[PDB]
Every structure is written in structure tokens, then in C-alpha cells.
Design a protein around this ligand. Structure first.
Ligand SMILES: [Mg+2]
Ligand SMILES: [Mg+2]
Ligand SMILES: [Mg+2]
Ligand SMILES: [Mg+2]
Ligand SMILES: [Mg+2]
Ligand SMILES: [Mg+2]
Ligand SMILES: [Mg+2]
Ligand SMILES: [Mg+2]
Ligand SMILES: [Mg+2]
Ligand SMILES: [Mg+2]
Ligand SMILES: [Mg+2]
Ligand SMILES: [Mg+2]
Ligand SMILES: [Mg+2]
Ligand SMILES: [Mg+2]
Ligand SMILES: [Mg+2]
Ligand SMILES: [Mg+2]
Ligand SMILES: [Mg+2]
Ligand SMILES: [Mg+2]
Ligand SMILES: [Mg+2]
Ligand SMILES: [Mg+2]
Ligand SMILES: [Mg+2]
Ligand SMILES: [Mg+2]
Ligand SMILES: [Mg+2]
Ligand SMILES: [Mg+2]
Ligand SMILES: [Mg+2]
Ligand SMILES: [Mg+2]
Ligand SMILES: [Mg+2]
Ligand SMILES: [Mg+2]
Ligand SMILES: [Mg+2]
Ligand SMILES: [Mg+2]
Ligand SMILES: [Mg+2]
Ligand SMILES: [Mg+2]
Ligand SMILES: [Mg+2]
Ligand SMILES: [Mg+2]
Ligand SMILES: [Mg+2]
Ligand SMILES: [Mg+2]
Ligand SMILES: [Mg+2]
Ligand SMILES: [Mg+2]
Ligand SMILES: [Mg+2]
Ligand SMILES: [Mg+2]
Ligand SMILES: [Mg+2]
Ligand SMILES: [Mg+2]
Ligand SMILES: [Mg+2]
Ligand SMILES: [Mg+2]
Ligand SMILES: [Mg+2]
Ligand SMILES: [Mg+2]
Ligand SMILES: [Mg+2]
Ligand SMILES: [Mg+2]
Ligand SMILES: [Mg+2]
Ligand SMILES: [Mg+2]
Ligand SMILES: [Mg+2]
Ligand SMILES: [Mg+2]
Ligand SMILES: [Mg+2]
Ligand SMILES: [Mg+2]
Ligand SMILES: [Mg+2]
Ligand SMILES: [Mg+2]
Ligand SMILES: [Mg+2]
Ligand SMILES: [Mg+2]
Ligand SMILES: [Mg+2]
Ligand SMILES: [Mg+2]
Ligand SMILES: [Mg+2]
Lengths: 177, 136, 48, 98, 48
RNA sequence: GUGAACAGCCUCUAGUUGAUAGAAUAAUGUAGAUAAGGGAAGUCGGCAAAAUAGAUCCGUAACUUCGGGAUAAGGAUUGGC
RNA sequence: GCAGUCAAGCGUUCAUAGCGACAUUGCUUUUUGAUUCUUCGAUGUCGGCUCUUCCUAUCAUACCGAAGCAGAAUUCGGUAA
RNA sequence: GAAUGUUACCGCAAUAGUAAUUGAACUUAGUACGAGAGGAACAGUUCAUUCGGAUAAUUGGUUUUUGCGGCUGUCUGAUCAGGCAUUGCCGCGAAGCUACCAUCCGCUGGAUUAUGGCUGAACGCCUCUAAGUCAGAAUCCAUGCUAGAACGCGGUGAUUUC
RNA sequence: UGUACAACGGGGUAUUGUAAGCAGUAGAGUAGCCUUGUUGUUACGAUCUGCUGAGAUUAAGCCUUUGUUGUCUGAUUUGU
């Protein structure tokens, strides 16, 4: 099956394809949330700890935290819930869902590095991706720099450069509150 | 089995000897099916011919529309009750016996099938597959 | 000794159970080494 | 190969073993042995039959060290800054004061 | 030893067991090993 | 005592504990039971067997000599405290 | 009841692919008669059930020769129980 | 099961018995043949019928395991624990037995028949036949399988002293 | 007279479905005594819960055993 691994310290991600049911077998009966040591899966992964976060089975149905169960069931889902986006106020839809217990019927696992290992995973530990946006609300700018209500914010707001051919521009947010 | 049965079929415990009445499980107008013969079956002094899942019997409609009563026609068995054992190791049985009336080619008279349907039947009779909801 | 059950994938092209697991009954017969203690030599005759 | 579980009792069902029952609503019930199969057919209720998983889960029998704490947490703390703004002038103006 | 070389395909097939049953045969065996059985039942009134 | 009861089943008083015995538990029997799925296809014929059953309440057709048919049929209920 | 010989005819033409009149030679002993030998100081009917074995005048299955056998289907025949 | 010195072990094999059966689907192939309509077969594959010989891992049936629990009626002052009701009744129930209701297994050489042929005379030609000979069937004989002659047999062990 | 055999006992494996006992602020509730309740008190109450997947049974044709106890020369017959 395919592994979907994220290093959320670097905001990196890359997928790994694991064949050999023996290496795959480590994840079986493990749920979402449960931690999984690494060496079992690959000799690269030695040291690493993985948190199981979700994934998809064949036919593509999502896992859903907390179902328990290692199969599919059909649930009434609501606003504010995994695996459903309501089209309309008060809309609820009965939809199939995959359980949160891993079996060989999954097309992909979703894993979330919690502890780095003895060696560096390629496009994961060695590359790093910057947050898209900066603090927009007044006090959030304060805390992302630790400033007290004395420093005045307008100079700490982030400014993003951008070229207009032979003119580079500078656009900052719009502080609020 | 036989005609329009593309495929072979592994044996399954015979469950419905001649005289058995099974639920009619389609929307043809028929409510039950009375088995009078099992196609493809063989001889033995005193043995009742008996059908199984996926078999084609000859039947009559004991209960149902009168246009369907009083005449013999082909039907396919789709659920059992007599448990039987697949090659994957399992003994399994349905809660009723049931079939769907069909032509010699194996095409279904009706257009839907109410109930689950055994895979071994689905696998054997394409039209039975089309009209199935849950298989096995 | 006795019997027990087995599980194995089937290899049999064209079978509807090609590449599918089957469960099969099996017997087990206890089989410690045998020990050789003699040799007997036979000859052919018109009486066998 | 998949070990299965008993709909009634929640015993593991290793291959070829107990029976499988497909009910009118195409709900599938698996039994490991005719004991569970009978109590089921008898409209008995697993949560009232004292030797079943389901009964035990409900009456909280011997779970003990599952309710015992664990050691699972992280230790991150790392910058990245904001995409488009020069992440080089985001640590020199990140000197704080309180 | 067989009296003929059988060329059956059925004979010839090379099996590879994936699982051998090992639960008790003195009743409805629920467990392969004492370990599995401990894992499932937890601690009993004897034991530790 | 249970219970409608001189029923069946258990008991007090009284009276018996008589019926060749021992050891095994092959076939075939006699007598007593059970069987998945089907359900009279068995048979001259449902022969044998199985199903039903008490009580309280509900609800009961053709037909009739108006008396019946009728426990018609068909349902629900029932312990202990 | 079963099988032949002759070959006038049938078969578009063509006796004999498949058939076959008038005649005529047989075989069989699950038909029915004819007889009256044995049994009337007893050899208990018909059918079915169960079960074995045998015959072949072969319905199917193996291998063949014919055809008015293009193919598919069929018909006739041989070795075959 | 007496007797062929005793007793034991391992074997031979005369004679007798004998067994496997049928169908479909895929593929060949929408091919050969046919104006068309239609429409095969051999090799290969997967299953099935009827039959047979076992076997009980699994599933199911059986229950005096009178094994555990439940229930009525009475009897032992109550309790505990029990007795009786031709096995009181009920649910579960190991073991054993057991079912195309369950699973597994059922061998390959030769010689022939019909028939088609080879060479080839009788009969200068011709002919599968007369001599000689090739190919050949659910047949036959062996292979294999069951018994093992209690008056068929072989190899081998040990063979008693008060 | 020894990796002996047996009877027990132990451990495993099975079957049932939670033993007796004791306790309880569980319980439709009920009695009795007053000091008539700012849980008054003493007991009773089908059933429930805890100790408790407990207790019971488990080779009579299951498996195993470092333990305990015992047993280990009676009879008849056979020769080329
Ligand atoms: Mg604002
Ligand atoms: Mg309907
Ligand atoms: Mg008959
Ligand atoms: Mg009517
Ligand atoms: Mg459709
Ligand atoms: Mg049962
Ligand atoms: Mg059972
Ligand atoms: Mg067993
Ligand atoms: Mg008297
Ligand atoms: Mg007498
Ligand atoms: Mg008597
Ligand atoms: Mg006696
Ligand atoms: Mg029955
Ligand atoms: Mg019925
Ligand atoms: Mg009849
Ligand atoms: Mg009827
Ligand atoms: Mg009849
Ligand atoms: Mg009559
Ligand atoms: Mg009649
Ligand atoms: Mg009667
Ligand atoms: Mg009954
Ligand atoms: Mg009436
Ligand atoms: Mg009440
Ligand atoms: Mg006749
Ligand atoms: Mg003439
Ligand atoms: Mg002609
Ligand atoms: Mg003419
Ligand atoms: Mg006479
Ligand atoms: Mg007479
Ligand atoms: Mg006489
Ligand atoms: Mg007489
Ligand atoms: Mg006589
Ligand atoms: Mg003949
Ligand atoms: Mg011929
Ligand atoms: Mg012509
Ligand atoms: Mg014969
Ligand atoms: Mg003969
Ligand atoms: Mg002797
Ligand atoms: Mg095609
Ligand atoms: Mg033409
Ligand atoms: Mg047969
Ligand atoms: Mg049994
Ligand atoms: Mg009892
Ligand atoms: Mg008490
Ligand atoms: Mg008495
Ligand atoms: Mg009596
Ligand atoms: Mg058989
Ligand atoms: Mg051979
Ligand atoms: Mg020539
Ligand atoms: Mg010749
Ligand atoms: Mg000759
Ligand atoms: Mg000649
Ligand atoms: Mg043969
Ligand atoms: Mg020979
Ligand atoms: Mg053989
Ligand atoms: Mg002898
Ligand atoms: Mg000898
Ligand atoms: Mg002793
Ligand atoms: Mg408990
Ligand atoms: Mg015995
Ligand atoms: Mg001890």
C-alpha cells in the first residue's frame, strides 16, 4: 500500500510505496492516533515514530476517527464532521465511510511523523516549506513577535515582495482589531 | 445450469428437492415457485432431483398473477438455507429459499430482485447479476 | 497422529479459485528416523 | 487470510470455522460455534450473557491498565516564517523585548 | 513412493502453506497458542 | 400437596421390596427418543409419527329442523415477587 | 414376435442409399392357443418393494464401414452386454 | 481351529475376485462446409453426473458426559445440598459414532475385434489374404488393488537337562 | 526393578456460564419500637451488584507429569 507521510515540523510531505505484506503487517489492527515505530516498515525509517492519522481504501472511501471497526459502514453525517461537506443548511447525508482500523484493504495510509529517526528521509527532513500567511489580527502580530501593547504593530506586519516586470511591489495585510 | 450458463460451477450441497417451494424474489408478479425438475441432474432409483444455489429448475407458480399460474417455466435458484461450504472454507446459509423466473437462455422475466443473492449464482448468470442489489 | 486444517493460495490457471486462498484438511503422521538392521536378497524363479 | 469475529460473542473466528448467516436485510452474521449460533437464533441478547466480550465491555470487566496513563507527546518548536516575505528579516526583527 | 510419474497439473502444483491450524481439537478451539489465549482473556484468578 | 378433580405426579398410615443370577454391550430385533435442508416427492391410502391442547380475554363463515353448526376458523395472554 | 431369399414396384431419373408386392425359407419361446406328462395325504395368485445374476433381438456410452453423408442433424450396417 | 519337531519374525504367490462411469462449459471458432439460413471436431483447460474405497481437521446430526445451567410438582422443619416423576422437562453441551448434510483418493503397459491398410501370388492383368505383415475399440491379458491354498512354498531368529 | 506399571494428586486442554459464603447507600416495598426524625432506629423484601469468566465437571477410548502411594515368579504345555 501507499504511505502518505508528513513532517509537520517542516510542513513537508512525500509518499512511500511499501510492498511485502510483512512490512505492511505492522500497521494492522493499529487504529488512528496510535503510534508506530519505524524500523519494522523500512530500514530507512529506523528511529522514526509514526502517528496514524487516516487514509483511503480501494474504491477510495476515507477513514473516520473513532468508528472503531476495520470495515466500511454507512453513516448519517452532519455539519462539522469528517468525510462530509453539507450542500445546504441542515443538510445531512447518509454516506459510506471506512473504519479507523488498518487492514490490507487500504489503498493509502496517512502518517504523521512525531519523532525523527536515526537517518534523514529524503524530501522530508531535508526540505522545508514556509507558512503561506502571516498574522493579520493585531494581537496575533503581537504574539508572533512578543511585543506588549507598547511596540505599535504597523512595522511588524509581514510584507510580501512581488515583481511587476520591472517594478517590485510590497503588500501587507490589513491589521484588524 | 447449462444453456446461457457461461461458467462452470463448483458443487454445492443440494438443498431443494423436487416439491420444495421457494420465495419468488423478482418483480415478475409471481410470489412463490414450486420446483418440479432440476436441469442437468442425473438418475438413481428413488433419488429426488435436487437444486442448489445457481441451478436452473423447471417450476410452476403456486401463488401469483393468474397469467403466470398453471404453466411450467424455467427459474434460477438465488438463495438457499441448507448450508453449504465454499472452497474458501466457510459454511454459510441464507434465511430463505428463493429464485427468479427466467427463460431457457437464462434471461430474467422480471427486472429487479428483492433480497441478497448468492455469488455463485451471480457469477453464473449475467442477467441475475445485473438485477442484483447485494451479492453474498 | 491426527488431522488439522491448512490455508494456502491456489495455483491453477483457469480455475475460479486461481490465486485465491482455499482451506484444506490434512493428516499428520509421526515419522521419527527409521533404523536399518538387515538386508534381504531375492532371486527370480519360474515360481516367482 | 483474515481472522474474523463472532457477531454474538466476539470470539475470533479463524478460517473455516463456525458458520455464516445472511439475513433477509443482507446483514451478515458470523458465528464461531453453534453455541453463539443458538443463543443468537434464540433472540438472546449478548449484553446479558455474562461470558461475552460485549457483556464484559458493558460491565467494565478487567480492562485495568487500558485506563492506566500513557507516554505519547511531541517536542517541536521551529520557524518557517511566511511565504513571500523574506524569511531572513523574520528573526532579526524577531528579537522580542518582553 | 508412487508407482507412476503423475503429470496431473493437480499433481505437479507446488504448494506453500500460509497457515496451519493449531487450536485444540478437544472442543471448539478458539486459540492457536497459550500466548494468544492470554492476550485475549487477560489475567485470571490463577496466573500472577 | 399440586390441581376443576376419586386425573396424572410426589407423600403419611399400613404393606411390599416377590419376578433365576453373573459378565459384556456385535449383528438383527422389541420397546422408548432425536435429527441439517426439503416437506407426502414415500404409500393402495399420510399407515406410523408429528402437530394441537389447560384457563382468561378478543373474535368467529356457509348452512339450519332456529335447537344448532361452535372450543367453528383466527388471535393475545399466563412465572416470581 | 423376430429374421431371411426372389425382385415386380417405391424412391424426380435410378430394383436393392433407405424400402419392397406376389410368392417363399426360417428362427424365437416374456403372446395366445393346442395337449394333459408331473403335482389335488398341497410345490400359498396378481402387483409392488428389496436384491443378485444372467441373455441380446443394443436405447445410451468406445471404435468403425454406408448414405439420396456439403455443414449441423439423422438413417443403415459391423466389433460390442 | 487339532495334526506335518517346537516357537517367533520377515516374505513368496498358485488360484479366486477386481472398477470405474457419464455429461457440460471455456477454448478451438462464429472456424472448417455452405448462396444463405446455419454450423462441427481432435489437442489444451475448468468443473459436473452415476459408482466405489476411506476418512472426522472443519460444518451439521445424535446426548446417560445424566457435564454445566435453568424449570414445574412433591418429599428431607428452614438453609445448604438433595431424593422421586420407567431418562420428569428445557437450553447449551465435550468424546465417540456419523452425512454427496462433511472432506479426501480411485493406476498404465501390452495383445486383439470390427474396420482401414502394406507386400503379394493364386489368375503374366488384378486384388488387405492365400504365405507373411502395419494400424486399431467402453473388449482381453497383464500392471495395480483385495484375499492368501487353513493338506502350495521361501528366508531368518531362538530352541527346555533335575 | 526402569524413560517400568498402576492409583491418586498437580499442570494443560474441554464444557457450562458466574459456586457456596459474606457484604452492600442496589430493590416495587413491608412490618415493629420510641427519643416521632432536619438519611430516627431495628430488622425482613422476588431480584440486583461485588469478591467472581467464577464454581463444577474434564477420560471413562483427551494431553502431560521430577510429587504421593503401591506393585513386580501364580498356572499349563511343547522336541527334529
Ligand atoms: Mg475590525
Ligand atoms: Mg415480493
Ligand atoms: Mg421408488
Ligand atoms: Mg386456489
Ligand atoms: Mg437493468
Ligand atoms: Mg446443534
Ligand atoms: Mg455440535
Ligand atoms: Mg474435536
Ligand atoms: Mg397384602
Ligand atoms: Mg418369569
Ligand atoms: Mg420385572
Ligand atoms: Mg440376564
Ligand atoms: Mg427433518
Ligand atoms: Mg411447509
Ligand atoms: Mg403420490
Ligand atoms: Mg401439497
Ligand atoms: Mg410412487
Ligand atoms: Mg384405495
Ligand atoms: Mg394409486
Ligand atoms: Mg394415525
Ligand atoms: Mg419438534
Ligand atoms: Mg366446520
Ligand atoms: Mg405479569
Ligand atoms: Mg412377445
Ligand atoms: Mg416378381
Ligand atoms: Mg440408384
Ligand atoms: Mg422405376
Ligand atoms: Mg397341467
Ligand atoms: Mg395338487
Ligand atoms: Mg403332496
Ligand atoms: Mg407346504
Ligand atoms: Mg417352496
Ligand atoms: Mg450381436
Ligand atoms: Mg466396422
Ligand atoms: Mg443418387
Ligand atoms: Mg456386465
Ligand atoms: Mg456372453
Ligand atoms: Mg500348531
Ligand atoms: Mg465465441
Ligand atoms: Mg447448397
Ligand atoms: Mg454408475
Ligand atoms: Mg459431535
Ligand atoms: Mg441438572
Ligand atoms: Mg442465604
Ligand atoms: Mg419414597
Ligand atoms: Mg408411577
Ligand atoms: Mg461418495
Ligand atoms: Mg501402474
Ligand atoms: Mg496396394
Ligand atoms: Mg485384415
Ligand atoms: Mg488370415
Ligand atoms: Mg484367395
Ligand atoms: Mg476401462
Ligand atoms: Mg500380454
Ligand atoms: Mg487400482
Ligand atoms: Mg497358508
Ligand atoms: Mg513357513
Ligand atoms: Mg497398584
Ligand atoms: Mg462474576
Ligand atoms: Mg468399550
Ligand atoms: Mg502433587
Amino acid at each position: 500500500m501507499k504511505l502518505n507521510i508528513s513532517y509537520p515540523v517542516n510542513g513537508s510531505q512525500k509518499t512511500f510505496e511499501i510492498d511485502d505484506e510483512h512490512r505492511i503487517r505492522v500497521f494492522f489492527d493499529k487504529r488512528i492516533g496510535q503510534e508506530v515505530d519505524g524500523e519494522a516498515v523500512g530500514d530507512e525509517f529506523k528511529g522514526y515514530v509514526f502517528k496514524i492519522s487516516g487514509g483511503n481504501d480501494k474504491q477510495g472511501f476515507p477513514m473516520k476517527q473513532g468508528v472503531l471497526l476495520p470495515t466500511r459502514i454507512k453513516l448519517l453525517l452532519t455539519k462539522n464532521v469528517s468525510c462530509y461537506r453539507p450542500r445546504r443548511d441542515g443538510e445531512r447525508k447518509r454516506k459510506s465511510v471506512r473504519g479507523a482500523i488498518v487492514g490490507p484493504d487500504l489503498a493509502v495510509l496517512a502518517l504523521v511523523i512525531v519523532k525523527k529517526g536515526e537517518q534523514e528521509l529524503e524530501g522530508l527532513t531535508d526540505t522545508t516549506v514556509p507558512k503561506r500567511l502571516g498574522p493579520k489580527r493585531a494581537n496575533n502580530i503581537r504574539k508572533f513577535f512578543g511585543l506588549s501593547k507598547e511596540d505599535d504593530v504597523r512595522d511588524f506586519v509581514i510584507r510580501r515582495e512581488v515583481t511587476k516586470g520591472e517594478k517590485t511591489y510590497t503588500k501587507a495585510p490589513k491589521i484588524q482589531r | 445450469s447449462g444453456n446461457g450458463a457461461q461458467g462452470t460451477k463448483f458443487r454445492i450441497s443440494l438443498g431443494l428437492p423436487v416439491g420444495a417451494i421457494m420465495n419468488c424474489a423478482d418483480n415478475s408478479g409471481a410470489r412463490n415457485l414450486y420446483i418440479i425438475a432440476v436441469k442437468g441432474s442425473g438418475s438413481r432409483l428413488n433419488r429426488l432431483p435436487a437444486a442448489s444455489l445457481g441451478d436452473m429448475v423447471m417450476a410452476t407458480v403456486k401463488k401469483g398473477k393468474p397469467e403466470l399460474r398453471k404453466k411450467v417455466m424455467p427459474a434460477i435458484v438465488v438463495r438457499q438455507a441448507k448450508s453449504w461450504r465454499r472452497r474458501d472454507g466457510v459454511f454459510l446459509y441464507f434465511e430463505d429459499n428463493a429464485g427468479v423466473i427466467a427463460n431457457p437462455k437464462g434471461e430474467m422475466k422480471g427486472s429487479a430482485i428483492t433480497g441478497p443473492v448468492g455469488k455463485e449464482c451471480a457469477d453464473l448468470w449475467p442477467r441475475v447479476a445485473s438485477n442484483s442489489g447485494v451479492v453474498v | 497422529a491426527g488431522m488439522t486444517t491448512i490455508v494456502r493460495d491456489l495455483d491453477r490457471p483457469g480455475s475460479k479459485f486461481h490465486k485465491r486462498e482455499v482451506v484444506e484438511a490434512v493428516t499428520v503422521v509421526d515419522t521419527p528416523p527409521v533404523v536399518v538392521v538387515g538386508v534381504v536378497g531375492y532371486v527370480e524363479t519360474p515360481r516367482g | 487470510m483474515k481472522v474474523e469475529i463472532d457477531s454474538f460473542s466476539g470470539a475470533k473466528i479463524y478460517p473455516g470455522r463456525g458458520t455464516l448467516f445472511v439475513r433477509g436485510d443482507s446483514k451478515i452474521f458470523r458465528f464461531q460455534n453453534s453455541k453463539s449460533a443458538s443463543l443468537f437464533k434464540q433472540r438472546k441478547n449478548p449484553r446479558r450473557i455474562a461470558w461475552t466480550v460485549l457483556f464484559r465491555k458493558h460491565h467494565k470487566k478487567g480492562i485495568t491498565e487500558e485506563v492506566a496513563k500513557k507516554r505519547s507527546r511531541k517536542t517541536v518548536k521551529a520557524q518557517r516564517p511566511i511565504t513571500g516575505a523574506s524569511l531572513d528579516l523574520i528573526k532579526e526583527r524577531r528579537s522580542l523585548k518582553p | 513412493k508412487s508407482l507412476y510419474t503423475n503429470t496431473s497439473r493437480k499433481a505437479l502444483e507446488e504448494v506453500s502453506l500460509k497457515w496451519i491450524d493449531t487450536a485444540s481439537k478437544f472442543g471448539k478451539g478458539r486459540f492457536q497458542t497459550p500466548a494468544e489465549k492470554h492476550a485475549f482473556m487477560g489475567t485470571l484468578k490463577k496466573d500472577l
